[PDB]
Amino acid sequence: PITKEEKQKVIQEFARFPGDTGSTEVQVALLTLRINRLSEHLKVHKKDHHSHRGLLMMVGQRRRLLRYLQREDPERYRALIEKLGIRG
Amino acid sequence: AVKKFKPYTPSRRFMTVADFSEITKTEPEKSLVKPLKKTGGRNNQGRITVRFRGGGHKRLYRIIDFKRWDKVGIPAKVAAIEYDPNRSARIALLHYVDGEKRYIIAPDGLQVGQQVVAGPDAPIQVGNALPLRFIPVGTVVHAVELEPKKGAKLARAAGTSAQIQGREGDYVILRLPSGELRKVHGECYATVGAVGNADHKNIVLGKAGRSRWLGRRPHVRGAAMNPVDHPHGGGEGRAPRGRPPASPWGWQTKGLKTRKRRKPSSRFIIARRKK
RNA sequence: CCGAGGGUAGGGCCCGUGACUGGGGCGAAGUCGUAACAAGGUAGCUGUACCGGAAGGUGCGGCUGGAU
RNA sequence: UGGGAGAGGGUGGUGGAAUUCCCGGAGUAGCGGUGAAAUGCGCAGAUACCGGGAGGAACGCCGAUGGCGAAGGCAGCCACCUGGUCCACCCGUGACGCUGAGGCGCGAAAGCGUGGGGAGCAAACCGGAUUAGAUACCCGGGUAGUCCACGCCCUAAACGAUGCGCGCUAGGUCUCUGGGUCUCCUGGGGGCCGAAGCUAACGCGUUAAGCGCGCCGCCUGGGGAGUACGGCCGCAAGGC
RNA sequence: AGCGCCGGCCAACUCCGUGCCAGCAGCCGCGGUAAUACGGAGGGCGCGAGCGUUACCCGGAUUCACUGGGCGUAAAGGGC
RNA sequence: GCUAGUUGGUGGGGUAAUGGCCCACCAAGGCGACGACGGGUAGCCGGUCUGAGAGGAUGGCCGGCCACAGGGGCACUGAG
RNA sequence: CCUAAGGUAGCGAAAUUCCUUGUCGGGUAAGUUCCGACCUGCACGAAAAGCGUAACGACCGGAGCGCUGUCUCGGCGAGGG
RNA sequence: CCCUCGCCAAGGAACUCUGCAAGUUGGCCCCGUAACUUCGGGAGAAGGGGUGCUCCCUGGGGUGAUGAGCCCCGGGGAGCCGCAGUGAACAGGCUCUGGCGACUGUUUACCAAAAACACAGCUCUCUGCGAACUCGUAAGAGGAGGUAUAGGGAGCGACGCU
RNA sequence: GAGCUAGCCCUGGCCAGGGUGAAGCUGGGGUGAGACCCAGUGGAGGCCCGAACCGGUGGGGGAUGCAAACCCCUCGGAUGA
Ligand SMILES: [Mg+2]
Ligand SMILES: [Mg+2]
Ligand SMILES: [Mg+2]
Ligand SMILES: [Mg+2]
Ligand SMILES: [Mg+2]
Ligand SMILES: [Mg+2]
Ligand SMILES: [Mg+2]
Ligand SMILES: [Mg+2]
Ligand SMILES: [Mg+2]
Ligand SMILES: [Mg+2]
Ligand SMILES: [Mg+2]
Ligand SMILES: [Mg+2]
Ligand SMILES: [Mg+2]
Ligand SMILES: [Mg+2]
Ligand SMILES: [Mg+2]
Ligand SMILES: [Mg+2]
Ligand SMILES: [Mg+2]
Ligand SMILES: [Mg+2]
Ligand SMILES: [Mg+2]
Ligand SMILES: [Mg+2]
Ligand SMILES: [Mg+2]
Ligand SMILES: [Mg+2]
Ligand SMILES: [Mg+2]
Ligand SMILES: [Mg+2]
Ligand SMILES: [Mg+2]
Ligand SMILES: [Mg+2]
Ligand SMILES: [Mg+2]
Ligand SMILES: [Mg+2]
Ligand SMILES: [Mg+2]
Ligand SMILES: [Mg+2]
Ligand SMILES: [Mg+2]
Ligand SMILES: [Mg+2]
Ligand SMILES: [Mg+2]
Ligand SMILES: [Mg+2]
Ligand SMILES: [Mg+2]
Ligand SMILES: [Mg+2]
Ligand SMILES: [Mg+2]
Ligand SMILES: [Mg+2]
Ligand SMILES: [Mg+2]
Ligand SMILES: [Mg+2]
Ligand SMILES: [Mg+2]
Ligand SMILES: [Mg+2]
Ligand SMILES: [Mg+2]
Ligand SMILES: [Mg+2]
Ligand SMILES: [Mg+2]
Ligand SMILES: [Mg+2]
Ligand SMILES: [Mg+2]
Ligand SMILES: [Mg+2]
Ligand SMILES: [Mg+2]
Ligand SMILES: [Mg+2]
Ligand SMILES: [Mg+2]
Ligand SMILES: [Mg+2]
Ligand SMILES: [Mg+2]
Ligand SMILES: [Mg+2]
Ligand SMILES: [Mg+2]
Ligand SMILES: [Mg+2]
Ligand SMILES: [Mg+2]
Ligand SMILES: [Mg+2]
Ligand SMILES: [Mg+2]
Ligand SMILES: [Mg+2]
Ligand SMILES: [Mg+2]
Ligand SMILES: [Mg+2]
Ligand SMILES: [Mg+2]
Ligand SMILES: [Mg+2]
Ligand SMILES: [Mg+2]
Ligand SMILES: [Mg+2]
Ligand SMILES: [Mg+2]
Ligand SMILES: [Mg+2]
Ligand SMILES: [Mg+2]
Ligand SMILES: [Mg+2]
Ligand SMILES: [Mg+2]
Ligand SMILES: [Mg+2]
Ligand SMILES: [Mg+2]
Ligand SMILES: [Mg+2]
Ligand SMILES: [Mg+2]
Ligand SMILES: [Mg+2]
Ligand SMILES: [Mg+2]
Ligand SMILES: [Mg+2]
Ligand SMILES: [Mg+2]
Ligand SMILES: [Mg+2]
Ligand SMILES: [Mg+2]
Ligand SMILES: [Mg+2]
Ligand SMILES: [Mg+2]
Ligand SMILES: [Mg+2]
Ligand SMILES: [Mg+2]
Ligand SMILES: [Mg+2]
Ligand SMILES: [Mg+2]
Ligand SMILES: [Mg+2]
Ligand SMILES: [Mg+2]
Ligand SMILES: [Mg+2]
Ligand SMILES: [Mg+2]
Ligand SMILES: [Mg+2]
Ligand SMILES: [Mg+2]
Ligand SMILES: [Mg+2]
Ligand SMILES: [Mg+2]
Ligand SMILES: [Mg+2]
Ligand SMILES: [Mg+2]
Ligand SMILES: [Mg+2]
Ligand SMILES: [Mg+2]
Ligand SMILES: [Mg+2]
Ligand SMILES: [Mg+2]
Ligand SMILES: [Mg+2]
Ligand SMILES: [Mg+2]
Ligand SMILES: [Mg+2]
Ligand SMILES: [Mg+2]
Ligand SMILES: [Mg+2]
Ligand SMILES: [Mg+2]
Ligand SMILES: [Mg+2]
Ligand SMILES: [Mg+2]
Ligand SMILES: [Mg+2]
Ligand SMILES: [Mg+2]
Ligand SMILES: [Mg+2]
Ligand SMILES: [Mg+2]
Ligand SMILES: [Mg+2]
Ligand SMILES: [Mg+2]
Ligand SMILES: [Mg+2]
Ligand SMILES: [Mg+2]
Ligand SMILES: [Mg+2]
Ligand SMILES: [Mg+2]
Ligand SMILES: [Mg+2]
Ligand SMILES: [Mg+2]
Ligand SMILES: [Mg+2]
Ligand SMILES: [Mg+2]
Ligand SMILES: [Mg+2]
Ligand SMILES: [Mg+2]
Ligand SMILES: [Mg+2]
Ligand SMILES: [Mg+2]
Ligand SMILES: [Mg+2]
Ligand SMILES: [Mg+2]
Ligand SMILES: [Mg+2]
Ligand SMILES: [Mg+2]
Ligand SMILES: [Mg+2]
Ligand SMILES: [Mg+2]
Ligand SMILES: [Mg+2]
Ligand SMILES: [Mg+2]
Ligand SMILES: [Mg+2]
Ligand SMILES: [Mg+2]
Ligand SMILES: [Mg+2]
Ligand SMILES: [Mg+2]
Ligand SMILES: [Mg+2]
Ligand SMILES: [Mg+2]
Ligand SMILES: [Mg+2]
Ligand SMILES: [Mg+2]
Ligand SMILES: [Mg+2]
Ligand SMILES: [Mg+2]
Ligand SMILES: [Mg+2]
Ligand SMILES: [Mg+2]
Ligand SMILES: [Mg+2]
Ligand SMILES: [Mg+2]
Ligand SMILES: [Mg+2]
Ligand SMILES: [Mg+2]
Ligand SMILES: [Mg+2]
Ligand SMILES: [Mg+2]
Ligand SMILES: [Mg+2]
Ligand SMILES: [Mg+2]
Ligand SMILES: [Mg+2]
Ligand SMILES: [Mg+2]
Ligand SMILES: [Mg+2]
Ligand SMILES: [Mg+2]
Ligand SMILES: [Mg+2]
Ligand SMILES: [Mg+2]
Ligand SMILES: [Mg+2]
Ligand SMILES: [Mg+2]
Ligand SMILES: [Mg+2]
Ligand SMILES: [Mg+2]
Ligand SMILES: [Mg+2]
Ligand SMILES: [Mg+2]
Ligand SMILES: [Mg+2]
Ligand SMILES: [Mg+2]
Ligand SMILES: [Mg+2]
Ligand SMILES: [Mg+2]
Ligand SMILES: [Mg+2]
Ligand SMILES: [Mg+2]
Ligand SMILES: [Mg+2]
Ligand SMILES: [Mg+2]
Ligand SMILES: [Mg+2]
Ligand SMILES: [Mg+2]
Ligand SMILES: [Mg+2]
Ligand SMILES: [Mg+2]
Ligand SMILES: [Mg+2]
Ligand SMILES: [Mg+2]
Ligand SMILES: [Mg+2]
Ligand SMILES: [Mg+2]
Ligand SMILES: [Mg+2]
Ligand SMILES: [Mg+2]
Ligand SMILES: [Mg+2]
Ligand SMILES: [Mg+2]
Ligand SMILES: [Mg+2]
Ligand SMILES: [Mg+2]
Ligand SMILES: [Mg+2]
Ligand SMILES: [Mg+2]
Ligand SMILES: [Mg+2]
Ligand SMILES: [Mg+2]
Ligand SMILES: [Mg+2]
Ligand SMILES: [Mg+2]
Ligand SMILES: [Mg+2]
Ligand SMILES: [Mg+2]
Ligand SMILES: [Mg+2]
Ligand SMILES: [Mg+2]
Ligand SMILES: [Mg+2]
Ligand SMILES: [Mg+2]
Ligand SMILES: [Mg+2]
Ligand SMILES: [Mg+2]
Ligand SMILES: [Mg+2]
Ligand SMILES: [Mg+2]
Ligand SMILES: [Mg+2]
Ligand SMILES: [Mg+2]
Ligand SMILES: [Mg+2]
Ligand SMILES: [Mg+2]
Ligand SMILES: [Mg+2]
Ligand SMILES: [Mg+2]
Ligand SMILES: [Mg+2]
Ligand SMILES: [Mg+2]
Ligand SMILES: [Mg+2]
Ligand SMILES: [Mg+2]
Ligand SMILES: [Mg+2]
Ligand SMILES: [Mg+2]
Ligand SMILES: [Mg+2]
Ligand SMILES: [Mg+2]
Ligand SMILES: [Mg+2]
Ligand SMILES: [Mg+2]
Ligand SMILES: [Mg+2]
Ligand SMILES: [Mg+2]
Ligand SMILES: [Mg+2]
Ligand SMILES: [Mg+2]
Ligand SMILES: [Mg+2]
Ligand SMILES: [Mg+2]
Ligand SMILES: [Mg+2]
Ligand SMILES: [Mg+2]
Ligand SMILES: [Mg+2]
Ligand SMILES: [Mg+2]
Ligand SMILES: [Mg+2]
Ligand SMILES: [Mg+2]
Ligand SMILES: [Mg+2]
Ligand SMILES: [Mg+2]
Ligand SMILES: [Mg+2]
Ligand SMILES: [Mg+2]
Ligand SMILES: [Mg+2]
Ligand SMILES: [Mg+2]
Ligand SMILES: [Mg+2]
Ligand SMILES: [Mg+2]
Ligand SMILES: [Mg+2]
Ligand SMILES: [Mg+2]
Ligand SMILES: [Mg+2]
Ligand SMILES: [Mg+2]
């Protein structure tokens, strides 16, 4: 799984200010982390459809946040997806 | 995975070729090849004794090490995996730390860079050779000697394997690739794993020409011949067989068992093949 | 030059019709059985599959919209 | 951020019971099967009993009016990978929300392709019965298939015959799983019985079929017909 | 002065003839020897240089429902 | 799904006049689930008919506009 | 009644159909051939495989357009004899 | 009279077992192209336009050097002549529809090239290896320096549904 | 007797020119990642057209021949069994 440590580093790396958890950026980046692992997991467990749904739900969730953040502050979005290498 | 073709000629529509994925070195070891003397199916009297052979691609014989107990305890590195035209299996190049090089037939899963060894103490892992008596019952195994120090004789074809079923005295009991149950002596070497290139059987030759490249010349039906030639020969128009179906030499060919009756190894065969 | 249209050739859509053929509706004064409705006399229905003169049957899985 | 329950999903291993077949032993006149029989099996030694072995498939008790999942569905045990979900803290974001024509994915069983595998079961099929007849029901056999991998099919009484989300309108009792000041209270789930109210009735009733808003899908007499034609999908069967 | 109608819907009833025939008919339905339902007759009702039939439009049809319907079991929730 | 005078541009031709209305060149555009393209049907309106209304149906006569003049094409004359 | 069991799907006047130029339909002015059908299959039928099948064929049928000394129907000319 | 060859009025397959034979078509560039399909094809489908020479303007490449010369691939405009411009020579007639065989291949040297044989592919069967099988009295060989995903024999003959 | 012919074995040689344009690869698009679509590149094949070469389809001629199997026209294959 993801370790508290790995989560923190990400929580910390993306936070807008020291105590920040749950801002848009932190939210998107955490998802990106769970996304890229499941994605990897499914690459090997191609018949794990049940987890694939979750993936979709997350992919969905990250999308809405990105749509929000893009509406609210273009620069922040452009930077975020660029920080995480996201669009396609 | 076998490789398909788009149907851009009538023949490519069904032709499939091997993927050669495991292959890492495309030239044989110069000191391990010698010319194969092509026979055409002719014996030393010059007579065809096996019909319909001749005309295939030229081939160099790769010398294979079917003994292995030859170098007990000396490990080797798997240097490469190569194509061998003389067999269905691929062959693995071994660099012994001794500095001697040999070929073995390449087991499923052999990795280039890995190390193999032979002897009573060898780890029970893919690529190693031990006498059967030191191999855990249940393990699948290949290139098996049929009698001690006489060389690997069993399970050499692409994809094949034998499984150890039990032990009895000086002998272990194997399930052969045919499903025959047979006793083989405990002192006989076998190599752990199955033979690789297991997709070999899914190849579709695709055209007459490809059998031709394999040195397999056209085969003609007794039914298409005349009575001078064959039991099924002649008759006006097409004909059914008109007698029990027979070989060119007259022996019956649908069911007639042919194994010699009083044969000494009958004593060691527990159960004739399945299906 | 363009040009009504004419001519040559190949396409698309639609209507009529056709040896023969597939079922359908109806009629009813028939033949064969009795599948469903009662536990309907093998609970029924079901998607699928194989099979049978016929309703139908059986297998697999599902539903109760099943009597006791 | 702390925690929780669960047959949720995928992979790899792995345990015992039973059935079948084979081998060894011991034993003999029947066994099996039905409403009753017969076919069948059995002195070429069956059944029943002991020991050995082989192989596939399903996991008894626990087990529940239980649990998990969006549904289809999911059950021996172990590890790894992985989804959903609930609780407590009231720490962060600042309406970032609901639904969703198309599209995409998943989708019991049967079925299909290529390759495995095959103990038990069992369409088709053979035979015995039953019977007026018996292409059935019951009995003896039996091939696909049922099992695995990979790719297809895309249906269903795929049902709660009940689309999703939100808000509002008495309670009683049983239960699963949390957190409490653990008598008792407070969440989230599963049943029952009921207030108001609904409703053609039957029944529904904080798990609404009540009172309301949002969005989607669907209906408009029975048959003909889920048929025809066309189109799109499919290897086919066939699907929309 | 004519024409339709007189079972119910729908206002207007008896006699003969016929006997599941001949026939009526918009729907439901009448006729098988006592038919207010067929045909004639008497009588009655309705309109009147008109009366009735056929065709078609809207209405009744809140039966496409905006006004103003619905989907557990009636047709109707998409398999998720 | 449709489009090559197609969508825009520059220059010119033409007209009473704008305009791809016509041409030459240049650019690669224009349209479409808010339904293009295609098929079918219909001249449109004032009105008319019905209906409580909302709606439905309709466009005969009269008035307004359009279109046509055996089926097509064409220009001449002319304010037209 | 008989049999070991009585030909399934598909196909069928067929490279198989005797009667036969079967019958009906199509094409032609006219069609023993050809195509489509029907089915009383003399005497199809499932790996001496059954029924189909895009592409292929100096294979074997039938039709049309194009064009011609093939023909109506022959004439002239050339060169080698 | 025969052979090989050229032309032919009107007709145009009426010839004949049969368009046999001979005509027609004919290269290249451009436009355009149906059923059906295994999505490759069917396709050069079909059908049609262009094709010489002269002058003028102009685009790109190779070799040079980046330029000249030389050589290569074009584009646009205006003309000239003839019956006719791949002007001679070499160079598909096409379509529709059935049978058979899937297909490229093979064959009766010298009367049959096919529907015959072969063929990928499907199935049955034998074969545990000093294999089965074949040749040989034998030795020895083939099989195979292969080992059941292999080798022998037999039928069937891509593929689809069986 | 395999200097003909048939098969095989060893070793060499030959196959003008033109066309079609598989996989792959690169780039663009697409998606969560993908499948996949487009372009360019590429140069596959018992692929196409056609000489050499190998054949021998149909016709005509030849028929005490040029020839005990030839000639003319036509036609099949021509990187492959
Ligand atoms: Mg979420
Ligand atoms: Mg985005
Ligand atoms: Mg292929
Ligand atoms: Mg491919
Ligand atoms: Mg092809
Ligand atoms: Mg092909
Ligand atoms: Mg390989
Ligand atoms: Mg491989
Ligand atoms: Mg080499
Ligand atoms: Mg050397
Ligand atoms: Mg040397
Ligand atoms: Mg050798
Ligand atoms: Mg020798
Ligand atoms: Mg000799
Ligand atoms: Mg000799
Ligand atoms: Mg032989
Ligand atoms: Mg030979
Ligand atoms: Mg190899
Ligand atoms: Mg291979
Ligand atoms: Mg194969
Ligand atoms: Mg070879
Ligand atoms: Mg063979
Ligand atoms: Mg053969
Ligand atoms: Mg033959
Ligand atoms: Mg013969
Ligand atoms: Mg002989
Ligand atoms: Mg003899
Ligand atoms: Mg003989
Ligand atoms: Mg014979
Ligand atoms: Mg015979
Ligand atoms: Mg014969
Ligand atoms: Mg004969
Ligand atoms: Mg015969
Ligand atoms: Mg013969
Ligand atoms: Mg015979
Ligand atoms: Mg036979
Ligand atoms: Mg016989
Ligand atoms: Mg032995
Ligand atoms: Mg014109
Ligand atoms: Mg025209
Ligand atoms: Mg004219
Ligand atoms: Mg009819
Ligand atoms: Mg009929
Ligand atoms: Mg029943
Ligand atoms: Mg009944
Ligand atoms: Mg019943
Ligand atoms: Mg059923
Ligand atoms: Mg019957
Ligand atoms: Mg049955
Ligand atoms: Mg269910
Ligand atoms: Mg025993
Ligand atoms: Mg005895
Ligand atoms: Mg026992
Ligand atoms: Mg807060
Ligand atoms: Mg939603
Ligand atoms: Mg949808
Ligand atoms: Mg499914
Ligand atoms: Mg299944
Ligand atoms: Mg199945
Ligand atoms: Mg299967
Ligand atoms: Mg029976
Ligand atoms: Mg009986
Ligand atoms: Mg029975
Ligand atoms: Mg049974
Ligand atoms: Mg049984
Ligand atoms: Mg069995
Ligand atoms: Mg099967
Ligand atoms: Mg089947
Ligand atoms: Mg249910
Ligand atoms: Mg539910
Ligand atoms: Mg439903
Ligand atoms: Mg919905
Ligand atoms: Mg609703
Ligand atoms: Mg509680
Ligand atoms: Mg507690
Ligand atoms: Mg639940
Ligand atoms: Mg509750
Ligand atoms: Mg429950
Ligand atoms: Mg209740
Ligand atoms: Mg009440
Ligand atoms: Mg309650
Ligand atoms: Mg209700
Ligand atoms: Mg209806
Ligand atoms: Mg349908
Ligand atoms: Mg259906
Ligand atoms: Mg259809
Ligand atoms: Mg449906
Ligand atoms: Mg009246
Ligand atoms: Mg009235
Ligand atoms: Mg009254
Ligand atoms: Mg009378
Ligand atoms: Mg009377
Ligand atoms: Mg009346
Ligand atoms: Mg009366
Ligand atoms: Mg009223
Ligand atoms: Mg209305
Ligand atoms: Mg009405
Ligand atoms: Mg409403
Ligand atoms: Mg209603
Ligand atoms: Mg219903
Ligand atoms: Mg539902
Ligand atoms: Mg669906
Ligand atoms: Mg222009
Ligand atoms: Mg202008
Ligand atoms: Mg004017
Ligand atoms: Mg215009
Ligand atoms: Mg619009
Ligand atoms: Mg619309
Ligand atoms: Mg019109
Ligand atoms: Mg009109
Ligand atoms: Mg009204
Ligand atoms: Mg109108
Ligand atoms: Mg009118
Ligand atoms: Mg008017
Ligand atoms: Mg006009
Ligand atoms: Mg006019
Ligand atoms: Mg007129
Ligand atoms: Mg006129
Ligand atoms: Mg018998
Ligand atoms: Mg039968
Ligand atoms: Mg039949
Ligand atoms: Mg016939
Ligand atoms: Mg005939
Ligand atoms: Mg036939
Ligand atoms: Mg016959
Ligand atoms: Mg005949
Ligand atoms: Mg005859
Ligand atoms: Mg006659
Ligand atoms: Mg006629
Ligand atoms: Mg005729
Ligand atoms: Mg005729
Ligand atoms: Mg003929
Ligand atoms: Mg003939
Ligand atoms: Mg003729
Ligand atoms: Mg015929
Ligand atoms: Mg007949
Ligand atoms: Mg036959
Ligand atoms: Mg026969
Ligand atoms: Mg058979
Ligand atoms: Mg035969
Ligand atoms: Mg035959
Ligand atoms: Mg047979
Ligand atoms: Mg055949
Ligand atoms: Mg056929
Ligand atoms: Mg065939
Ligand atoms: Mg064909
Ligand atoms: Mg051919
Ligand atoms: Mg051939
Ligand atoms: Mg041919
Ligand atoms: Mg002609
Ligand atoms: Mg002449
Ligand atoms: Mg002359
Ligand atoms: Mg002359
Ligand atoms: Mg002369
Ligand atoms: Mg002369
Ligand atoms: Mg002439
Ligand atoms: Mg002329
Ligand atoms: Mg003509
Ligand atoms: Mg003509
Ligand atoms: Mg004639
Ligand atoms: Mg004649
Ligand atoms: Mg002919
Ligand atoms: Mg000819
Ligand atoms: Mg010519
Ligand atoms: Mg030419
Ligand atoms: Mg020619
Ligand atoms: Mg066509
Ligand atoms: Mg064709
Ligand atoms: Mg295509
Ligand atoms: Mg052309
Ligand atoms: Mg042309
Ligand atoms: Mg010119
Ligand atoms: Mg010139
Ligand atoms: Mg000139
Ligand atoms: Mg140079
Ligand atoms: Mg230069
Ligand atoms: Mg030309
Ligand atoms: Mg010349
Ligand atoms: Mg040509
Ligand atoms: Mg054709
Ligand atoms: Mg033909
Ligand atoms: Mg046929
Ligand atoms: Mg025929
Ligand atoms: Mg052929
Ligand atoms: Mg042939
Ligand atoms: Mg075929
Ligand atoms: Mg074939
Ligand atoms: Mg062939
Ligand atoms: Mg060819
Ligand atoms: Mg050929
Ligand atoms: Mg001969
Ligand atoms: Mg010959
Ligand atoms: Mg001769
Ligand atoms: Mg001869
Ligand atoms: Mg000859
Ligand atoms: Mg010949
Ligand atoms: Mg030929
Ligand atoms: Mg010949
Ligand atoms: Mg042959
Ligand atoms: Mg053949
Ligand atoms: Mg086959
Ligand atoms: Mg196979
Ligand atoms: Mg031997
Ligand atoms: Mg011998
Ligand atoms: Mg011998
Ligand atoms: Mg030897
Ligand atoms: Mg040997
Ligand atoms: Mg050897
Ligand atoms: Mg071998
Ligand atoms: Mg054959
Ligand atoms: Mg053959
Ligand atoms: Mg097909
Ligand atoms: Mg020779
Ligand atoms: Mg020679
Ligand atoms: Mg060589
Ligand atoms: Mg060549
Ligand atoms: Mg070439
Ligand atoms: Mg070339
Ligand atoms: Mg390819
Ligand atoms: Mg590459
Ligand atoms: Mg790419
Ligand atoms: Mg490419
Ligand atoms: Mg190129
Ligand atoms: Mg090429
Ligand atoms: Mg070729
Ligand atoms: Mg070619
Ligand atoms: Mg030449
Ligand atoms: Mg040369
Ligand atoms: Mg030669
Ligand atoms: Mg030859
Ligand atoms: Mg010739
Ligand atoms: Mg000729
Ligand atoms: Mg000749
Ligand atoms: Mg001749
Ligand atoms: Mg002659
Ligand atoms: Mg001669
Ligand atoms: Mg010649
Ligand atoms: Mg030629
Ligand atoms: Mg040639
Ligand atoms: Mg050719
Ligand atoms: Mg060839
Ligand atoms: Mg060629
Ligand atoms: Mg070629
Ligand atoms: Mg070739
Ligand atoms: Mg070669």
UniProtKB/Swiss-Prot annotation, chain A:
SUPFAM superfamilies: S15/NS1 RNA-binding domain. Disulfide bonds: none annotated. The keyword RNA-binding applies. One of its GO terms (cellular component) is cytosolic small ribosomal subunit. Pfam families: Ribosomal_S15 (PF00312). GO terms for molecular function: rRNA binding; structural constituent of ribosome. SMART domains: Ribosomal_S15. One of the primary rRNA binding proteins, it binds directly to 16S rRNA where it helps nucleate assembly of the platform of the 30S subunit by binding and bridging several RNA helices of the 16S rRNA. Forms an intersubunit bridge (bridge B4) with the 23S rRNA of the 50S subunit in the ribosome. Part of the 30S ribosomal subunit. Forms a bridge to the 50S subunit in the 70S ribosome, contacting the 23S rRNA. This is Small ribosomal subunit protein uS15. It comes from Thermus thermophilus (strain ATCC 27634 / DSM 579 / HB8).
Swiss-Prot record, chain B:
Residues 229-239 have a biased composition (Basic and acidic residues). Gene3D superfamilies: 2.30.30.30, Nucleic acid-binding proteins, Ribosomal protein L2, domain 3. It comes from the Bacteria. Residues 256-275 have a biased composition (Basic residues). GO terms for molecular function: rRNA binding; structural constituent of ribosome; transferase activity. Residues 222-275 are annotated as: Disordered. One of its GO terms (cellular component) is large ribosomal subunit. One of its GO terms (biological process) is cytoplasmic translation. Keywords: Ribonucleoprotein, Ribosomal protein, RNA-binding, rRNA-binding. Belongs to the universal ribosomal protein uL2 family. NCBIfam families: rplB_bact (TIGR01171). Part of the 50S ribosomal subunit. Forms a bridge to the 30S subunit in the 70S ribosome, contacting the 16S rRNA. May also make transient contacts with protein S6 during translation in the 70S ribosome. One of the primary rRNA binding proteins. Required for association of the 30S and 50S subunits to form the 70S ribosome, for tRNA binding and peptide bond formation. It has been suggested to have peptidyltransferase activity; this is somewhat controversial. Makes several contacts with the 16S rRNA (forming bridge B7b) in the 70S ribosome. This is Large ribosomal subunit protein uL2. It comes from Thermus thermophilus (strain ATCC 27634 / DSM 579 / HB8). The gene is rplB.
